[PDB]
Amino acid sequence: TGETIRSQNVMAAASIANIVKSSLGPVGLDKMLVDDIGDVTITNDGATILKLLEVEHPAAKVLCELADLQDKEVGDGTTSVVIIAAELLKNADELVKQKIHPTSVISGYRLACKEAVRYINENLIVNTDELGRDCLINAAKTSMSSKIIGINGDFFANMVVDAVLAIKYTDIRGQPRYPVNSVNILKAHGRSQMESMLISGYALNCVVGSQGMPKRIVNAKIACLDFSLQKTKRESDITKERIQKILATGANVILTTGGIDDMCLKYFVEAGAMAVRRVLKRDLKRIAKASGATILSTLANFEAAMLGQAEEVVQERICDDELILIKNTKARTSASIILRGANDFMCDEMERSLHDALCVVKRVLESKSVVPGGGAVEAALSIYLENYATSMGSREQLAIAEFARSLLVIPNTLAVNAAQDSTDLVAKLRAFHNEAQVNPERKNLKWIGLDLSNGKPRDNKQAGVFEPTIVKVKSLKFATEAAITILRID
Amino acid sequence: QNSGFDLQETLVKIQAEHSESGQLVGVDLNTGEPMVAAEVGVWDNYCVKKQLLHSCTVIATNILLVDEIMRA
Amino acid sequence: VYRNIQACKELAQTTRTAYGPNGMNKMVINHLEKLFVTNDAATILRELEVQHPAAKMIVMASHMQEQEVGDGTNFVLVFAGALLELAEELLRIGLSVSEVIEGYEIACRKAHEILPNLVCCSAKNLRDIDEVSSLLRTSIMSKQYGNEVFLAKLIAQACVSIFPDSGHFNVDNIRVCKILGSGISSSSVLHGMVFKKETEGDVTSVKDAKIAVYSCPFAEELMNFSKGEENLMDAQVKAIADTGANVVVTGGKVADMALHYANKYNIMLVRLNSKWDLRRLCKTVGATALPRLTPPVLEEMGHCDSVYLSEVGDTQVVVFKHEKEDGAISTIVLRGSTDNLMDDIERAVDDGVNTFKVLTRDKRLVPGGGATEIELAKQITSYGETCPGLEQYAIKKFAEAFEAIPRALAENSGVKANEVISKLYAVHQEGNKNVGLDIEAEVPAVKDMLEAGILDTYLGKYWAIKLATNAAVTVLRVDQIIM
Amino acid sequence: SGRKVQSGNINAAKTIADIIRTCLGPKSMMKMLLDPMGGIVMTNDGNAILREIQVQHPAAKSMIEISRTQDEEVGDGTTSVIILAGEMLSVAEHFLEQQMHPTVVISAYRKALDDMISTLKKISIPVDISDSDMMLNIINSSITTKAISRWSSLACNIALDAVKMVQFEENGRKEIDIKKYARVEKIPGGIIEDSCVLRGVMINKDVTHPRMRRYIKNPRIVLLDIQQLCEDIIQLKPDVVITEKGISDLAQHYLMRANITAIRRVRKTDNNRIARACGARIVSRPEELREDDVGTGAGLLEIKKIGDEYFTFITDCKDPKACTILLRGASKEILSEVERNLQDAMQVCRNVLLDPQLVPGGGASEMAVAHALTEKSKAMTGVEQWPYRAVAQALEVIPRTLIQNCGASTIRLLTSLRAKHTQENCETWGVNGETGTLVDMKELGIWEPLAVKLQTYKTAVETAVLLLRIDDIVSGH
Numbered sequence A: 001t002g003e004t005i006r007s008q009n010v011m012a013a014a015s016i017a018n019i020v021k022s023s024l025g026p027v028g029l030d031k032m033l034v035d036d037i038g039d040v041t042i043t044n045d046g047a048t049i050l051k052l053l054e055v056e057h058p059a060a061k062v063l064c065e066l067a068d069l070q071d072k073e074v075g076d077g078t079t080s081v082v083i084i085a086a087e088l089l090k091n092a093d094e095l096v097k098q099k100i101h102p103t104s105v106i107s108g109y110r111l112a113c114k115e116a117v118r119y120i121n122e123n124l125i126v127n128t129d130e131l132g133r134d135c136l137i138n139a140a141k142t143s144m145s146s147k148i149i150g151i152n153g154d155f156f157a158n159m160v161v162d163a164v165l166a167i168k169y170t171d172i173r174g175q176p177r178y179p180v181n182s183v184n185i186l187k188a189h190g191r192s193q194m195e196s197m198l199i200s201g202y203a204l205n206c207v208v209g210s211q212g213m214p215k216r217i218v219n220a221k222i223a224c225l226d227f228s229l230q231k232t233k234r235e236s237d238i239t240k241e242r243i244q245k246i247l248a249t250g251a252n253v254i255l256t257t258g259g260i261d262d263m264c265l266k267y268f269v270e271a272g273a274m275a276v277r278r279v280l281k282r283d284l285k286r287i288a289k290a291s292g293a294t295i296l297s298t299l300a301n302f303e304a305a306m307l308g309q310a311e312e313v314v315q316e317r318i319c320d321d322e323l324i325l326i327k328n329t330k331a332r333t334s335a336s337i338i339l340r341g342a343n344d345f346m347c348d349e350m351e352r353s354l355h356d357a358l359c360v361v362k363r364v365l366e367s368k369s370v371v372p373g374g375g376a377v378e379a380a381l382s383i384y385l386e387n388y389a390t391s392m393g394s395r396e397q398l399a400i401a402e403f404a405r406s407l408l409v410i411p412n413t414l415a416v417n418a419a420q421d422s423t424d425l426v427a428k429l430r431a432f433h434n435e436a437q438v439n440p441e442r443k444n445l446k447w448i449g450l451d452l453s454n455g456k457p458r459d460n461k462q463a464g465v466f467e468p469t470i471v472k473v474k475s476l477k478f479a480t481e482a483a484i485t486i487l488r489i490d
Numbered sequence B: 001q002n003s004g005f006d007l008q009e010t011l012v013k014i015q016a017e018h019s020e021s022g023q024l025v026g027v028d029l030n031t032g033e034p035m036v037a038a039e040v041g042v043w044d045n046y047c048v049k050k051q052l053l054h055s056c057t058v059i060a061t062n063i064l065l066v067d068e069i070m071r072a
Numbered sequence C: 001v002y003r004n005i006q007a008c009k010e011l012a013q014t015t016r017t018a019y020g021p022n023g024m025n026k027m028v029i030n031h032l033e034k035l036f037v038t039n040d041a042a043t044i045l046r047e048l049e050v051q052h053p054a055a056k057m058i059v060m061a062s063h064m065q066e067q068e069v070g071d072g073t074n075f076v077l078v079f080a081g082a083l084l085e086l087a088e089e090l091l092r093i094g095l096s097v098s099e100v101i102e103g104y105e106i107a108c109r110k111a112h113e114i115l116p117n118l119v120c121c122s123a124k125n126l127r128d129i130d131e132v133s134s135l136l137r138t139s140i141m142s143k144q145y146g147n148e149v150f151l152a153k154l155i156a157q158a159c160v161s162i163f164p165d166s167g168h169f170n171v172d173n174i175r176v177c178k179i180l181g182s183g184i185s186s187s188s189v190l191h192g193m194v195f196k197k198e199t200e201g202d203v204t205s206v207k208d209a210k211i212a213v214y215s216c217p218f219a220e221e222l223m224n225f226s227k228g229e230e231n232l233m234d235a236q237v238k239a240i241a242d243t244g245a246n247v248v249v250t251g252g253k254v255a256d257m258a259l260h261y262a263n264k265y266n267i268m269l270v271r272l273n274s275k276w277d278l279r280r281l282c283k284t285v286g287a288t289a290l291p292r293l294t295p296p297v298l299e300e301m302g303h304c305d306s307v308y309l310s311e312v313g314d315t316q317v318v319v320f321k322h323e324k325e326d327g328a329i330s331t332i333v334l335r336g337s338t339d340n341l342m343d344d345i346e347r348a349v350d351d352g353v354n355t356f357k358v359l360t361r362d363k364r365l366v367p368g369g370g371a372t373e374i375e376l377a378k379q380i381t382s383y384g385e386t387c388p389g390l391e392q393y394a395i396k397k398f399a400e401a402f403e404a405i406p407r408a409l410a411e412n413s414g415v416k417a418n419e420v421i422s423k424l425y426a427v428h429q430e431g432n433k434n435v436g437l438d439i440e441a442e443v444p445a446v447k448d449m450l451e452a453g454i455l456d457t458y459l460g461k462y463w464a465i466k467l468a469t470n471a472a473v474t475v476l477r478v479d480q481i482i483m
Numbered sequence D: 001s002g003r004k005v006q007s008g009n010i011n012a013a014k015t016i017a018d019i020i021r022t023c024l025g026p027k028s029m030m031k032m033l034l035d036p037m038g039g040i041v042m043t044n045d046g047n048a049i050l051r052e053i054q055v056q057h058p059a060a061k062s063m064i065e066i067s068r069t070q071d072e073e074v075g076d077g078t079t080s081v082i083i084l085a086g087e088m089l090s091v092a093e094h095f096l097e098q099q100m101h102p103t104v105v106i107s108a109y110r111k112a113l114d115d116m117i118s119t120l121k122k123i124s125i126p127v128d129i130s131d132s133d134m135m136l137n138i139i140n141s142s143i144t145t146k147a148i149s150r151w152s153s154l155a156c157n158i159a160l161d162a163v164k165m166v167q168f169e170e171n172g173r174k175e176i177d178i179k180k181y182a183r184v185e186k187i188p189g190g191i192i193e194d195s196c197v198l199r200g201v202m203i204n205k206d207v208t209h210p211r212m213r214r215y216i217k218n219p220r221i222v223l224l225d226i227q228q229l230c231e232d233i234i235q236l237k238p239d240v241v242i243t244e245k246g247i248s249d250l251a252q253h254y255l256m257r258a259n260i261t262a263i264r265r266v267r268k269t270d271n272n273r274i275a276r277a278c279g280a281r282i283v284s285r286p287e288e289l290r291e292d293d294v295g296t297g298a299g300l301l302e303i304k305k306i307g308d309e310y311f312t313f314i315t316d317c318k319d320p321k322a323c324t325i326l327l328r329g330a331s332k333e334i335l336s337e338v339e340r341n342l343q344d345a346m347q348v349c350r351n352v353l354l355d356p357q358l359v360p361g362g363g364a365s366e367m368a369v370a371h372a373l374t375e376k377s378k379a380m381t382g383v384e385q386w387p388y389r390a391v392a393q394a395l396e397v398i399p400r401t402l403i404q405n406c407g408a409s410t411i412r413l414l415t416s417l418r419a420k421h422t423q424e425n426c427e428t429w430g431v432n433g434e435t436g437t438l439v440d441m442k443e444l445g446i447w448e449p450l451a452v453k454l455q456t457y458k459t460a461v462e463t464a465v466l467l468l469r470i471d472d473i474v475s476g477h
C-alpha cells in the first residue's frame, strides 16, 4: 500500500539525511562506501559522501543537486544544509497532515528565512580587527586542543598568529587575502619544539651556499634560474659568460636550483650569489612572487629591474642547522616556521595541528563578517523565530514555528556525535539564549555555543569557534529552496 | 570429572602412583591429586562394595544375554 | 542449567524497575479481575504465578526474607538475578559449577564480617518520637511516593512508639482501618480496633462488657403466622438478652423490628461485620463464634472495655479500646479518595512497622541508597586478588553483584547507570562510606547519606545478603529436569 | 541499523579471526581447504587460509588486507594481529550494547595502546648487535620450528652478511634498511653449501660476444634508455655505459671505439639495483649534458661462465647497499623460506640498530603488559576505565591459545600465570608451547624483536578503532 507521494519524497529525503547525519562535526564517525566492483572508501566529511553515494530516488536527487551546488559556492555545510532541509520537509509534511495547505507553508518558510537572514546580520561579529588578539589565540588552541602541547600552547599560538598576520597581501579591491601555501614547514634536529622561533623569510635546510653574504646587504636581487651551473666540454659551457651578463644587468643573489658552480666561491664574494641544490618548486614560486622575480629557463637573449629585491640576508645556524635568510622581499610571501625536534615523523601531529590552526585562522581573516559556531547561531535564531511567528496571526504562524523548531537539529546532531545527550545540551543552549533577549543587561550571552570536547555550554566568541556569515546564509537559503521545491511536488 | 579436573590426567596420575607404590591411592576432590585415602579418612563400606560387584555383574550379563525384543 | 538462570533473569528483570523510591508501579489484575495498580514487589510477586522451579525457589527465598525481616525482598531478587547472570558468564568462561559455588560461599562469608564495620547506630532508644521519625523515614519513602513520607512516617511511628515496653513488639498490635473519604491529611493515630456500625442507640460509658460474636448472619392464619414469627424472634432476642449481654454482632443487614427489640432492652445492634473481622475480634477479646441465635451463654461470650461511636474523621466508627493488656492494640485511621491508593499506604505502613521492629531487635544502622553496596563491592573486589586460586573469579563476580544494586536504583530514576556507578566508585575511595546516590538531581551526582539521614537497618541487609547468596547457590546446584 | 551495523562488523571480524585462532604457536593445527572440484589441501600458515577463503563482508576484506600489508612489511606475526584485533572487537560488544558511544571506546583503546607501547619499551631486555652467539640464539628462537631446522646453520651466516650489506645512510647512521635491494641469486643445482655472499651488484645478463674490453679497473656505469649519442657519450669518456637495447656486432665495434660496454634485456629489478649499488645517472638531453652526467661507480668487473651459462660479475661497487647474495641447492621449496626468515633476521638487526632490545616470548610479554595495564587502571578514573581494563583482559589470548592447542587446560594455567605476575615484580614468566607448562622464558630462550611486537600491537589497535569507527556501509546493499 501507499499514498500521498509527497510523504514518499519526504521519507526519501529523511533517509538520505540519516545516511549522513552521524558524520556532522569534526568528531563525526566514518562511512565505508562500497561500489559494485567491491572497492571501499573511508571519509569523515559528508560532502564527498553525497558526491559518492548512489542516489536513486528522484526526490533525493534534488537534495543531492542542491548540496552539490552549495559546495560550489563556499564548500562547507553540505551536511548541515541537507539535514536542515530534511527537518523542514518532515515538519512541513506534518503541517500538511494537520490540514494546512502547502502554499501557506511555503510562504511561511520564505518569510522565516528572510527574517532569519535579517536577524543574523545584526547579531554577528566584526571584531576580527587589529584589536582581536586573544580570540585568534584561543581559536588556534581550540583547533589544537586535546594534545600534549597544551602546556606551552600560548607561545605557538602567538607565533602562528604573528606569522599569518605579518604576511598578508592587499588585493585590487582592498580586501586582505592570504595564501595558505605562503608559509611552509622546516624540520630541525636537536632540542624540542619549545625553542622554535619564527623565521621572517623562506629558509631551506640544505648545504651551505656561501659565506659571502654580509650581515645585511643593501640590495639582494633574486636572479632565480633552473639549470645546473656545471662545467661542460651566450656560452657553450654555462658557467661564466651568462652569470657575468646577469651580474652586469644587476643580479645580486642569483638563485640556482640545480648544482652549484665549481668556482662559485670567487664569484660569490664580489657579487654574493646563491648556490644550493634542490630548491623546492612550491617554495620557488612563492619566493618568486614574493620578491617579484620570475624563473628564467634560458639567459641567452627584462633582467635589470624585473628581478625581485630583498632587504637583507642573514647567515646563521638555527638548531644546529644552517638556513638561508632570504627575507623582507618586495611582497610578503617569503616566510617559514622552523620545527625544532629530531624529525618530521615524530611531530607529524604537531605540524598537522599547525596547518589546521593556520587554516582556521585564514578562514576568519577573510570574510571579516564572522558568526559563532558550535550551534550558537541555530539556537539564537530558534529563539528569535518563535517570537517572530507569534506576532504574525496569519496562516503562516505554524510554518514559521516549525521552521524555528527544526532549525535546532544542527546543535542537536553536534551534541549527539559528541557522545552527550543532545537534550541537555540543546536545552541549556536555549535557556542561555532566552535571557539573551528577555534580559537586555545580559546581552553579552548570545555567543554561547556547545563545546564538543567537554559537552558543556561555553562562550565561543571568546573561545574562537567561528564561521563565515556567507556560509550559513547560503546554507539556510539553499535548505529553504530545497524544502520549497520538495513541498511543491504533488 | 565432577570436580572439574581432567578426566584422563587424574586417572593416569593415580595409576602411576599405585604402580610405583603399593598404597591404595585415590583421587582428592579439592586439588585433583593422588591421595592415600587411608590417612585422609575416606573409608567406604566393605559390604557395599561386595554387593556392588555382585549386582553389576549379574545385571550386565542379563542385559547382554537378551535378543529379539517382542511386543507381548 | 542455563534455562534456570534465564528464568531467574527474567524474574529479576520483572521487578527490578520497582526498586527504590522511583518504582515504576505496575497494573495488577488478580484472578477476580480487579484493576489494581501498585509498586510493591511482594504484591506483584504474589499475583504473578511463577511457574519455573528456579523462579519458585528465588520467590521462596524472598518470602523467607520478608517473613523474618519484613522488607528488602526486591533487593533479594535483584541481587540473586545479578549473581546468576555473572555465574552464567563464569560458566561460559569454563569454570565448573562447584568452583563458583565455593567462591560465592567464601565471598558471602567475607561480606558478612565486612558489613559490621559500616554502622552508624540509632541515637538513644525507641523513644524520642521525633528521632524515630528520622529513623523510620527511609523505608516509607522507598515503598510509596517520596512526597507523602513526611506525614506517613510520623503517623506510622507515633502509633508504634506507644508501647516500647519490655523490648517486646508484635506487628499485629499495629492494626490499620480503612476509611474511605477525603485525602490523607485527615488520617491520624487512634487506639483500639475500629470499624463502622449502623444503629445509633448506643451508650458511650461502658465498663467491662459482655460481647456477642456471630458466625452466621441474618385471613386469620396469616395474622397468626406473623404473630408466631414475632414471638419466635422475641424468644431469640430474650435468649441473647440472657446473662445481661449488651452488644450483638451480625454480618448481614439491619431489621426494623430487630433494632426495635434491641432498643427495648438497650442493646447496640452492631452491624456491618466484615469477613476479615470475625476471628481477629475473637483474638483481641478472647471470645468464640456462635452459630445461631439460640446458643449464647455466659461462657460463650466476649468482654470488651469501652464501646462508643467516634465521629472523628467525619465518619461514625465503633472502637473497642483498652483491652486486656490496656494498650496493646493501636489502630491507624487512613483516609483516601479510593481504595487502590489506600492499600499502598497500608503496605507502606506495614513495612515501616516491620523496620521499627527490626530496630527494636537491634540498633545498628547502615548507610543505604547505594552506599553500603558499593563499599562492600569495593572491599570484596580488593580482597579478590589477595586470594590466589580459581575462587577469585567468583569473588569478583560477587563484588559486581553488589555493584548491580545502585545501578538499578539509578536506572529507576532516569540517570545513566554507568556514569553514576563510575563516579560513585571513584568518590567512594576518598569520600568514603557515607556517600550515596542523590535522587532529586537529574545530573548523575552523588551525595553523602548521613546528613541526608537516609539509613536502613543492618540486620535487614545482613539477612538479605545471606538469603540471596543461599538462593543463588542452591539454584546453581541443579542441572536439569525434563519439563 | 544504528549500532547493529557495528555489531555485524565486529561479528564478522570475530569469526574471520577465530577461523585461524588455533593455527599459531609451535603446535599449530592443520586446516583443510577444499576447492569446488573435490581437491583437499592442508595448511599451517594462516595467510594461505585467508587467501584461498572467500568472504562476503567488506570488514572481513579490510582485515584480510591489513594482514596482507602487515605480512610484506614485517614478515611473520600475521596470525597474531588477526587474533588480537578479533578479540578486541569481540570485547567491544559489552560496551556497545551498554549504549555508550564508540568515541569513548576508541579513546580508551588509544590510551591503552600508548600504555602498552610504554610497557613494552620498559620490559624489553637490551641486546647488542654483531654478537654471533646470541644472534644464533635469536635464530633458534624465531627461524626454527619451521622446515629450516636442519638447514638453519647456513641461514645464520647468510642473514649475518645480509644485515650488513643493505646499509642505508639516509636519515642517520646506518639505521635505515630495505629488503628488496639485496641482489638475491637463486640458482638450483648442486650441493647447498655452494651458496655464499659477494660485495657488489650481481647481473644475470651479459653481452652476446664478450670479445671486447669488458672488465676495467673502474666501472663508472652510465644509464641510457644512435650514433650521435655514441659520440656524445665521449663527453666524459666512461668505461661502461648500460642501456636496455640489443647490441649488434657493428654496434659492438662502435662500443670499443667509444670504450663502453652496453647491455640488453636486463630487467628493471636488475637495473635499479645496479644503479643503487654503483650510483649511476641517466641523461640524454644535450642541454642537460653537464658535469653531473657520469657518477663514480664500481672499481672491479669480472666475467664468469658460472654453470656453463653467461653471467656478469660487478664487485667493489661505490655503494655497498645492493651486494651479491648467492643461493644454491636442489630445489626452491626451502630457499624461499630461507629468504623470508633472513628477512625476519634483517628486521631483528635493523630494530636492534634502532632499539637494541628483545622481549620475552610464549605469551610472557602479553601477560606482563596486561598486568601493567590492569594495575594502571586502578589509579585512573572516569567512565572509560572499563574498556581500558577490557583490552588488557582480552590481550591475553596468545597464552590462552598457546595453552589451548597444546593439551593443557587454559583456565588453570592462565590463573597460575597471572598469579606469577602480580605478587612477583621482576619475573615476566610465560608458557612453554611444547609441553604446555609454565616456564621462565629467559631460561627457555624464546624472544621476539621489539619492531614486530610494536607493529602487531599498533596494527591491532588501529584495526579495532577503524572497524569501530565505521558507522555505515551504505553505498548499495
Ligand SMILES: Nc1ncnc2c1ncn2[C@@H]1O[C@H](COP(=O)(O)OP(=O)(O)O)[C@@H](O)[C@H]1O
Binding pocket: A023, A024, A025, A026, A045, A046, A047, A075, A076, A077, A078, A079, A080, A142, A143, A373, A374, A375, A410, A450, A452, A465
Ligand atoms: N572546532 C569546532 N567546534 C565546534 N563545532 C565545529 C568545529 N568545527 C566544525 N564545527 C561544526 O561542524 C559543522 C559542519 O562542519 P563541516 O562538517 O566541516 O562542514 P561540512 O558539513 O560541509 O563538511 C558546523 O556546523 C560547525 O558548527
Ligand SMILES: Nc1ncnc2c1ncn2[C@@H]1O[C@H](COP(=O)(O)OP(=O)(O)O)[C@@H](O)[C@H]1O
Binding pocket: C018, C019, C020, C021, C023, C041, C071, C072, C073, C074, C075, C138, C139, C141, C142, C143, C368, C369, C370, C409, C437, C438, C439, C454, C456
Ligand atoms: N532517597 C533515597 N535515595 C536512594 N535510595 C533510597 C532512598 N530511599 C530509599 N532508598 C533505597 O530503597 C531500598 C529499599 O526499597 P525497595 O527496594 O523499594 O523495597 P524493599 O525495602 O522491599 O527493598 C533501600 O536499599 C534504600 O537504600
Ligand SMILES: Nc1ncnc2c1ncn2[C@@H]1O[C@H](COP(=O)(O)OP(=O)(O)O)[C@@H](O)[C@H]1O
Binding pocket: D023, D024, D025, D026, D028, D076, D077, D078, D079, D080, D145, D360, D361, D362, D363, D398, D402, D431, D432, D433, D434, D446, D448
Ligand atoms: N617454543 C615455543 N614456546 C612457546 N611459544 C612459542 C614457541 N615458539 C613460538 N612461540 C610463540 O609463537 C608466537 C609467534 O608464532 P605464531 O603465533 O605461531 O605465528 P606468527 O609468528 O605468525 O604470530 C610468538 O609470540 C611466540 O611467543
